[PDB]
Amino acid sequence: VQLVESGGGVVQPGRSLRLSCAASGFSFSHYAMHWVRQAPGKGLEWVAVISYDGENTYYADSVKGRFSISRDNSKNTVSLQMNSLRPEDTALYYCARDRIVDDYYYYGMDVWGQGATVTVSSASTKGPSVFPLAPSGTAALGCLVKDYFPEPVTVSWNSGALTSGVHTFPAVLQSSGLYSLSSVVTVPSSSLGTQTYICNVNHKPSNTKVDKKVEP
Amino acid sequence: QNITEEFYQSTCSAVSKGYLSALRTGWYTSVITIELSNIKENKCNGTDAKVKLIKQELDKYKNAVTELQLLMQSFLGFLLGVGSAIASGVAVCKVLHLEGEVNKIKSALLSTNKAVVSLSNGVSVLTFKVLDLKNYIDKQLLPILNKQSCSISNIETVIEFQQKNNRLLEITREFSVNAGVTTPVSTYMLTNSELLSLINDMPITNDQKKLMSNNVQIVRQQSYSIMCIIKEEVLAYVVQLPLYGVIDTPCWKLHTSPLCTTNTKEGSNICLTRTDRGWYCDNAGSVSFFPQAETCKVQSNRVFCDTMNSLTLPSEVNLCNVDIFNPKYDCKIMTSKTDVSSSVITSLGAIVSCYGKTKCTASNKNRGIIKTFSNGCDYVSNKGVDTVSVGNTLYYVNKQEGKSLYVKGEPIINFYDPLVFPSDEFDASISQVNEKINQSLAFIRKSDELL
Amino acid sequence: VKLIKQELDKYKNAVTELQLLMQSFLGFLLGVGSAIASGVAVCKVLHLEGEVNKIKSALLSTNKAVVSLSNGVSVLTFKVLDLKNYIDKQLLPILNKQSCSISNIETVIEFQQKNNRLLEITREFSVNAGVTTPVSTYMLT
Amino acid sequence: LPLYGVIDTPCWKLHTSPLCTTNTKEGSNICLTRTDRGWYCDNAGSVSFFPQAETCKVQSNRVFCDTMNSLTLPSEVNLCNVDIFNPKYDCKIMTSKTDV
Amino acid sequence: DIQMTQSPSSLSASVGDRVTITCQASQDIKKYLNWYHQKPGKVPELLMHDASNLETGVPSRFSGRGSGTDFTLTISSLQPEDIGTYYCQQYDNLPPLTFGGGTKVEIKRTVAAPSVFIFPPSDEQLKSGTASVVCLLNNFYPREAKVQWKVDNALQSGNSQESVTEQDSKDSTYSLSSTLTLSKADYEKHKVYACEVTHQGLSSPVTKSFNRG
């Protein structure tokens, strides 16, 4: 009763893409298969539902024709082809099992997986740039990541040793179309120049770990 | 790509084309034996309860064998021609009834409990000795059931004897419960492992050997067993198993539904059905037709049937599934004037002959009425539906895996016109109906023409 | 010990049979109907891998409960006879490899009385092509 | 198991016998029977007709029957029990020439 | 296409309270509706199906009722794990299927005091060609926390942004930072860099200040 996704990435508008769904541990043969999408920080709206056999398929009207749903019994696999991509299709996608067995007339979705995030935009992939934020009883320091895409980037301090006082603020898309945020750590002010600080920011789409130390 | 279905609206019929044939085109005899005991009357002056239990078990056996002694035998579908099912088994039993053969068989089965032996009549048979009563009655009770010293404190003796006895007790029960002739044959006549051994040891092909070794669940309903003899110290009884001389042939089932005109008048209606519902299985270049579905059985994808309720029809009869009007083979049908509603069950759906005004509907368990029909031959699948209601009957649809095809076409009933048609035909066909219609037209016209 | 072994082997033949038998005048116009569609359809729903674990979990405490299959239509299930107990914690701890001290005779009697029910279940499965009517009490007390 | 969605409805059985003329001649006889022997049970405003009595069973004054051998016939079919000649519903019969 | 409106768009309560959420359909549907849970940062979880049949493996606290076009979800006693977002879906006899607008669920705190800080940008960022001065707000609530930048008495609008956090787990408070980004050439022109913070807890707005070099 596991479902995983592969192929999730980024691409410029008007370019085809594929998402593969792999199921395990249950009757992938008797069930209708669902795809749903949710933009980050937004509600759901249906993507598509492919019949248990792959003969009959149904799509959302706003994406009718753009999508192409396929299913392979031999590879225990489902697949979604996305053609003529639009900027508004950016979202996290969930591949789901139907609530009832081998039913042409569809129902909700019962078993879901972790979900794969897909981003579409003119701007291309880019690794973040780290800029410290140094001081001038309790004080603070920080470091800010600018000019990266897509979200998210995971921030730690001293390789994550300090799990208290860490505040990772959400990024704001500047008019230039790039992500930018600033992570902050609050500690006693007496610790200035006492405990060495290194903040690490991980961005997996670019496969980068930018490391930077902050000093007055 | 194994099973599917196609329904023709041309004559309102359904065809289920997936099942694989299993035709018993041969029989096979096997005389099983159980080594009895001509027990000398028991005798113990002094009653211990265990001794009484042993005596009661022995007397139960004696009543079993007394019973056995006294039981030692001392719509188209009406032209098939019946056949003697029990001829082979009782014929072999009769061969045994000749005085000498029983000693021969006993000697041949003295060492093992499975051997191929040649009877007096020439046809070789295979025989077993599954249960041995002589041992556990002679060399386990008599030495310990002495006249006076009936020391049987060991209780478990009776339990072992009962477990080795109940098999033959049920054998005699089934002999006295089915006129000595029963079908299916219970395991107490042939243990399932003994059956697998029998199938593996008999003369058939390796593919057929595996085929019939793993397919017991239907064989018993296609098997038979009558009593042969208790002649000398042994209970010998024949078993009649199939021999699949036709296998690996793709064969199908045909289901039928009336066609009618749909006049608003409930009366004066004209109705036609295909009267050939049943089984078609291919054996020797021509199809084998079973008219009544009570002679054929189903197992996943293997349909097991007995050909004694079968005719051989030309392969051109398959063309009756595409063009009922073709003159190559005169397709068989039945016509009637009664307008009523009904439905029939195919392999992956149901055909609603919704006639009159009954509220017919197609639905699923959790959806309810999803489709409503209107006064005519219609068909629905199993895909999204498992409840079809007509009048007050609420049929389920077999949910096997398959692909459903629905050939559109104008029903032949449209060609037939009222005011001339005969309102009574069951064994009729296309050619017969056309001949009668032409006769009626000729009579009507010559009566008018002579004016 | 011989009797205990024979009873266990009788059960094993019963379950071998169960294994091998796995199943995947006016009055002439009625239109026949599929009697076994619903039961074998529910069985097919069971043949989906996940359902049996859920059914077992829902029947772990009691032997009667309403459960919702994968196909949607709710069903009600019992666990009338429990072979796992009397084969696990009442023979195996007393049927050790060498120290097969089963002097207590009534072990076999109890096992037989708790076994004959399922033995008749398998017999009827093999006596009626796995499809019987009426259903004997050993199918439902 | 069954689910009796129709109960507490008074339903009846029909038994049939041939009519014939009674000429002294054993041959040339004419015979008619009502060919509707069976069971009628009322469920939803129209009767339910079981043609062959091998699909219905009896216990005291309550009869338990299976419906898959049932048709739904108009209530006017009950009038075939009083006036077979009534044109409301064409009553079903059989005719034959054998005198036994 | 079937359009379903969910109300209220967002909701808040406290632990142990009761909440009711409505889902209205454009056209009549007999009983074909499901209620869906979605925990924060997790996959959606289906509360119940058919609008009145719970999905086993979940507490009985959830209940669903209604008919026709209107359905209702009722929670008797809220729990901290019950936060997240609740949705409704329909499967009325045919596709296309559709989801609802959404009902967020979070908890209140009975106002807590804020905190204020201020910091300049790094150095090599100045070499890159752009500077960014940050005024920092941490451990604050409600959201009515405004920051005014002052650079030689020239408030900056249309070139600055703010970023606020979610409900934390221990202190539960948010954290907001306002960043003002300018070019190095324009950033070097001025000297004074201050941020003025207005918040409910701070009856007297705070005035953080720092220089350039």
CA gap B433, B437 in Å, rounded:
6
Enter the tokens of residue B76.
């188209």
Specify whether the CB–CB gap between C137 and C118 falls below 8 A.
Answer: no
**Interface-testing mutation among D39, D50, D52, with chain C (most C C-beta atoms within 10 A):** D52
CA gap E162, A169 in Å, rounded:
9
CA gap B65, B255 in Å, rounded:
49
C-D CB pairs within 8 A amount to: 18
Specify whether the CB–CB gap between A1 and A26 falls below 8 A.
Answer: yes
φ/ψ of C83, rounded to 5, equals: -85, -25
Specify whether the CB–CB gap between B67 and B176 falls below 8 A.
Answer: yes
Nearest to B293 by CA among A150, D50, C32: C32
Closest Cβ–Cβ partner in A49, A129, A133 for E97: A49
Interface of chain D against chain B, CB under 8 Å? 6, 43-44, 46, 48, 67-68, 70-73, 90, 92
What superfamily in CATH does domain A129-213 come from? Immunoglobulins (2.60.40.10)
Interface of chain C against chain D, CB under 8 Å? 25-27, 30, 32-33, 35
CA gap B305, B215 in Å, rounded:
13
3-state SS, chain C, equals CHHHHHHHHHHHHHHHHHHHCCCCCCCCCCCCCCCCHHHHHHHHHHCCCCHHHHHHHHCCCCCEEEEECCCCCEEEEECCCCHHHHHHCCCHHHCCCCCCCCCCCHHHHHHHHHHHHHHHHHHHHCCCCCCCCCCCCCCCC
CA gap B329, B324 in Å, rounded:
9
* Distance between first and last Cα of chain A: 53
3-state SS, chain D, equals CCCCCCCCCCCEEECCCEEECCCCCCCCCCEEEECCCEEEEECCCCEEEECCHHHEEEECCEEEECHHHCEEECHHHHHHHCCCCCCCCCCCEEEECCCC
Distances (CA, A) of B144 to A26, B49, B87, B138, B141: 61, 16, 45, 10, 5
Largest Cα–Cα distance of chain D, in whole Å?
56
The residue length of chain B stands at 451
CA gap B432, A63 in Å, rounded:
59
Specify whether the CB–CB gap between E139 and E173 falls below 8 A.
Answer: yes
Please count the other Cβ atoms lying within 10 Å of the Cβ belonging to residue A8. Answer: 17
Nearest to E207 by CA among E148, E152, E159: E148
Query: Which value, in Å, is the radius of gyration of the alpha carbons in chain E?
Result: 24
Dihedral through CA E23, CA E26, CA E30, CA E33, nearest 10? -40
CA gap E189, B435 in Å, rounded:
112
Residues 6+ apart with CB under 8 A from B175: B67, B68, B71, B182, B227, B237
CA gap E111, C95 in Å, rounded:
70
Rounded (10°) angle between helices C2-20 and B192-201: 60
Nearest to E160 by CA among E169, E170, E150: E150
Output the DSSP codes for B223-271.
Answer: -BEEEEE--SSEEEEEEEEEE-SEEEEE-EEEEE--EE---S-SSS--E
Shortest Cα distance, chain A CAs vs residue E162, angstroms:
7
Type of residue at C23: Q
CA gap B69, B100 in Å, rounded:
19
Residues 6+ apart with CB under 8 A from E76: E18, E61, E63
Contact between C71 and A1 using a beta-carbon 8 Å cutoff? no
Please count the other Cβ atoms lying within 10 Å of the Cβ belonging to residue B49. Answer: 8
User: Any chain A CB within 8 A of the CB of C48?
Assistant: yes
| Contacting residues of B for E30, CB less than 8 Å apart | 368
Distances (CA, A) of B51 to A72, B153, C32, D57: 71, 8, 58, 48
Rounded (10°) angle between helices B156-175 and C2-20: 30
Contact between B391 and D68 using a beta-carbon 8 Å cutoff? no
Experimental method: cryo-EM
Type of residue at B336: S
Enter the tokens of residue E137.
């707000």
Query: D touches E (3+ CB pairs < 8 Å)?
Result: no
What 8-state DSSP symbol labels residue A41? T
Closest Cβ–Cβ partner in B267, B338, B392 for D70: B392
Distances (CA, A) of E18 to D26, E8, E50: 92, 14, 22
Enter the tokens of residue B29.
């005899």
The residue length of chain E stands at 213
Q: Are strands A129-133 and A17-24 parallel, antiparallel or unpaired?
A: unpaired
The residue length of chain A stands at 216
DSSP-derived 3-state class of residue E82: helix
Q: Print burial letters for B402-418: b (CB count within 10 Å at least 16), e (below 16).
A: bebeeeeeebbbeebee
Query: Any idea where the domains of chain A sit in the sequence?
Result: 2-120, 129-213
Beta bridge partners of A119: A10
Please count the other Cβ atoms lying within 10 Å of the Cβ belonging to residue E76. Answer: 12
Enter the tokens of residue B177.
């419960």
Q: Which residue of A has its CA nearest to C50?
A: A26
Rounded (10°) angle between helices C51-58 and C37-46: 90
User: Any chain E CB within 8 A of the CB of A133?
Assistant: yes
DSSP-derived 3-state class of residue B407: strand
**Burial of residue C68, with CB atoms counted within 10 A of its CB: 0-12 exposed, 13-18 middle, 19 or more buried:** middle
Dihedral sign computed on CA atoms, order A134, A140, A141, A145? negative
Q: Which residue of D has its CA nearest to C27?
A: D51
Q: Are strands B5-8 and A179-188 parallel, antiparallel or unpaired?
A: unpaired
Please count the other Cβ atoms lying within 10 Å of the Cβ belonging to residue B163. Answer: 16
Specify whether the CB–CB gap between B280 and B17 falls below 8 A.
Answer: no
Q: Which residue of A has its CA nearest to C69?
A: A100
CA gap C1, A72 in Å, rounded:
54
**Which E residues, 8 through 27, put their C-beta within 8 Å of a C-beta on chain A?**
none
Rounded (10°) angle between helices B101-108 and B87-96: 90
CA gap B27, B203 in Å, rounded:
12
**Interface-testing mutation among C28, C30, C38, with chain D (most D C-beta atoms within 10 A):** C30
Please count the other Cβ atoms lying within 10 Å of the Cβ belonging to residue C9. Answer: 10
- Show which subunits contact C, needing at least 3 CB pairs below 8 angstroms: A, B, D
**Which pairs count as long-range contacts for C66-70, CB under 8 Å and 24+ apart, including other chains?**
C68/E53, C68/E56, C69/C42, C69/C45, C70/A27, C70/A30, C70/A31, C70/A100, C70/A101, C70/C45
CA gap B261, B417 in Å, rounded:
9
**Interface-testing mutation among B2, B364, B383, B401, with chain A (most A C-beta atoms within 10 A):** B383
Specify whether the CB–CB gap between E208 and E197 falls below 8 A.
Answer: yes
What 8-state DSSP symbol labels residue A87? G
Please count the other Cβ atoms lying within 10 Å of the Cβ belonging to residue E197. Answer: 24
The residue length of chain D stands at 100
Whether A2-120 and A129-213 share one fold: the answer is yes
Is the bond leading into E142 cis (omega within 30 degrees of zero)? Answer: yes
- Cα angle E82-E83-E86, degrees, rounded to a multiple of 5: 90
Contact between C72 and A99 using a beta-carbon 8 Å cutoff? yes
Enter the tokens of residue B354.
């919704």
Largest Cα–Cα distance of chain C, in whole Å?
73
Contact between B399 and A104 using a beta-carbon 8 Å cutoff? no
User: Any chain C CB within 8 A of the CB of A209?
Assistant: no
| CA A201 to mean position of chain CA atoms | 16
Q: Are strands B376-381 and B349-354 parallel, antiparallel or unpaired?
A: antiparallel
Closest Cβ–Cβ partner in D48, D90, D92 for B392: D48
Specify whether the CB–CB gap between D79 and D86 falls below 8 A.
Answer: yes
For A2-120, CATH gives: 2.60.40.10
Contact between B393 and C44 using a beta-carbon 8 Å cutoff? no
CA gap B272, B413 in Å, rounded:
7
* Distance between first and last Cα of chain D: 44
Shortest Cα distance, chain C CAs vs residue D66, angstroms:
11
Residue B368 parent element (H or E)? strand B368-372
Nearest to A153 by CA among A141, A168, A166, A167: A168
DSSP-derived 3-state class of residue B116: strand
Please count the other Cβ atoms lying within 10 Å of the Cβ belonging to residue A149. Answer: 21
Q: Are strands A129-133 and A138-148 parallel, antiparallel or unpaired?
A: antiparallel
Closest Cβ–Cβ partner in C32, C123, C129 for B345: C32
DSSP-derived 3-state class of residue B111: coil
